[PDB]
């Protein structure tokens, strides 16, 4: 597979990004989407015998 | 930063001293240097001049 127009070449530094020196901190946060809870309880009945 | 501009201009000529194209090149800034009107001096018998 050779490169194509498609073919998508990305250099981060053509982006503006933080410099952090020694002793530096840097943070980032997320928030999730909702998004449905994974059940942690199982069934005591077979659906097909309800 | 000759903002006067006192200092002979020698950007903007087409010369080899521009920064690098990609980001991820380390600028060598060129050494500075102009050149300046004068007398011609021939060269004693020579001819040749400077």
Known sequence: KLASEES????????????LGTGGT?????????????????CSQ????M | VDHE???????GQGQDTL?????????FPPQ???????DVNTQGISGDSK
């Open chain 1, 26 to 42: 840097a943070t980032m946060s997320y928030k999730f989407p909702p998004v449905p809870p994974e059940n942690l309880e199982g």
């Open chain 2, 32 to 38: 500075y240097a102009y050149l300046t009107v004068g």
């Open chain 2, 19 to 27: 920064a690098p194209e990609l980001p991820i090149w380390v600028y």
């Open chain 2, 5 to 11: 501009y006192k200092y002979p201009y020698v950007l």
């Open chain 1, 8 to 19: 998508a070449f990305y250099v981060l530094e053509h982006s503006s990004f933080q410099l």
């Open chain 1, 46 to 49: 077979h659906f097909y015998e």
